[PDB]
Symmetry: D3
Subunit: 148 residues, 6 copies
Amino acid sequence: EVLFSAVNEIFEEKIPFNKIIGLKVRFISPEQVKLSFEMRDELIGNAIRRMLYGGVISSAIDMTAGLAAFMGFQEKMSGKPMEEKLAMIGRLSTMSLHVEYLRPGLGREFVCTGYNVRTGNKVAVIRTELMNDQDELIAVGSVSYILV
Amino acid sequence: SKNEEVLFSAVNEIFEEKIPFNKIIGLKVRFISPEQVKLSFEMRDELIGNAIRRMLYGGVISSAIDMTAGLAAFMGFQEKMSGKPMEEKLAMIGRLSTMSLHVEYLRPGLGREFVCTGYNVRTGNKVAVIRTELMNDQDELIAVGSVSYILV
Amino acid sequence: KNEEVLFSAVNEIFEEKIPFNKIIGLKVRFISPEQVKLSFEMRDELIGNAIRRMLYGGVISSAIDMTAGLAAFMGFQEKMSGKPMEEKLAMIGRLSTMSLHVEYLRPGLGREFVCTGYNVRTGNKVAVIRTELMNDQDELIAVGSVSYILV
Amino acid sequence: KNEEVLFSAVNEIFEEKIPFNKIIGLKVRFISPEQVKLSFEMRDELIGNAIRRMLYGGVISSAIDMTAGLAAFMGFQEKMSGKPMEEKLAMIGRLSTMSLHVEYLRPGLGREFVCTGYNVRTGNKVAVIRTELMNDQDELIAVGSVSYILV
Amino acid sequence: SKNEEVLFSAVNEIFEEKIPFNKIIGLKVRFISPEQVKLSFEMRDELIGNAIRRMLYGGVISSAIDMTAGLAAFMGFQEKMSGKPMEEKLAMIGRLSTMSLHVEYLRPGLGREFVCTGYNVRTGNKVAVIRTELMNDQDELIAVGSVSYILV
Amino acid sequence: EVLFSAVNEIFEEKIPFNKIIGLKVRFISPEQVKLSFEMRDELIGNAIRRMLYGGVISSAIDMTAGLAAFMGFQEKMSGKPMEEKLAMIGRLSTMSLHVEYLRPGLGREFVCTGYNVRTGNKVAVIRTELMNDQDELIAVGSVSYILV
């Protein structure tokens, strides 16, 4: 209850990129997370549109994996209060980001699902799947998050 | 050279002025060549006190590496278009798409200005493999990247 | 019925349906949602060919990809709990390899060899399979990581 | 003589010698110490097979491995400057794949397709080749990283 | 359990006393199980003032990860040997050989005592894939490893 | 002249592992380096002999790659004195070490060749090949070195 409320504030309301790319937390659990993204500016007519979409997709994947890593690490913090769990999210840092693109993005809205593969002591490995409006897989990702 | 200045000027317009993300993350083209490019970036909002600051910088770093790699890919492919005019070279940049983006982070960026250098390892017929190094204000290596671009 | 008809439908497609059967034999030994096993047989030994080892590398990669494809199918059809067998068999046509990573240990250019496929994780769209390929004498000759998607 | 006899010797081994020729055709289009190009042709379309895309994944990986094997050969024979042609042709039998990494973009299940192999770096024992596989319409359908060793 | 103590005791002998490198890098078995192991290491000579100190620690870290992975591989394989005696389980450890060692370093170790935890991801018929995390005195992550072991 | 003398001191004489594994610099150049190693204790009869050889091979590869990285970085230090070049070797640190083993080590003496693939500003990527007495490739490696 308090976890979903705290996570929504941080991810939906407090990110200043919101003016250019919308973000909504659709699902959260210790094993799986789902974020939906909305391109407020679709970038039609830009000379490097495809290129710019590459960076947007990598950031979307990294963000989804960061929320998945948080849910994996907070699950292990069993008897800790909500303040210390919320403080831990600020220590999450990406160690490795591997993204393979299957086709061009070029869409208004896309969705990204993050599956927590294994959460060790310090490293949380997440596998991601990013699709468009039409339920078509456009990119897949392997992301490693650590506590710094 | 006459062709090198029209190439540099065309590229500067596309990357420095025409990108709409410039109002949140500034981008300047420091250097270009067929085998190496160099972009400098500036965080206009450093995101101090944001609960997921380190996380947001991960996405920023991955975008900067992808953009640097994209420009390096362009410089490799245009070199192979020897006898073609400048119009066809500029038109080709819209077909460049990322196939694979691998980024390894040594530490969290947490700096305002950072510079990224892209080295074109090999340019095949349809694939351009770029190796990148991203560093901060203080010339410290914060991330390295391997990026593959293709002509779609 | 539904357990038996799966095994029968899968065997017909992989064993009898494949046209390369004259060149390379293929038999489904074991199937399950998490694990699968295929046995192979070289009908032509290729004894005398100057690029024999080179041809075997392609045979091994194809065997690994086929075993992974069967393993991917078993992972995806497990998630289709409420669907009928006509839709499950139609889904096998949608399976396409996204990434094939094979590591070769020792050239095991033998008549018969077996490949086992382990379903590491099946997401919504991607199925990651780990494979082990061994020869007549049970010696590991190659390992593989294969990613399959529903196109 | 030595330039011409290399092309002729290589073509006989890859084009005429291979027994899979009835299933899949293979022609050597271009060869050099740094680059090679092979064109392929599906003799059987496989039109009607339920696991068509799955069979094509194996065909693509084999084509990539074969092209890389030819590219590896050209890299190693360049280093054998003072040796005769009998030793160079004997060396092709020692070529074995160590690692095969293939990434698939779009299913290009066409009749004809071409694969180009670039020799990235040839060390003392290891030859690393980068491959690009495209269809009739010049569209990139797969890329590959292949490592070959002299066994 | 009777079998768990004879397994732990047999392993402790092989890793803590029988390794001849123990006079330069100490090794102690902190924890063992079929899905996870934990080894602690001690640099007896820290190599202070050596011109290539950081470099030498790279090799030490790679060995520690490989050893931790080897023990985790053993614990995975012996679990599959359910009805076999303790003699055959111990004999199997001599057939374990590293197939692939991938190590990513976050910072240079430069500490006396460091701990490495090995997690057995999957144990197939002939291959054991282990994920490792190596940390220092201060519980800071200095390196991560992916190691594959096979029965030769 | 002075470079070969300085490198030999550091690698052959000043490494305390010398009592268990011998090391000799056979060749050095900006593009290629070669080290030969000697197992002073062959470890016959040890229960985890194969396992112990895995760690020795990874260290040998990492060391060869470190010397190759040094030769790549010092080449770029064109007009600098010998003292600053020698000081730079202390800043070399391994970032990534990838080793693939083709067969067991189990030999008295083995040789490792390091080829400098590309040396950028901060990263030096080295490809290694480790063989035994019989000229048989036993392991290959990809190693990344950085200046910290």
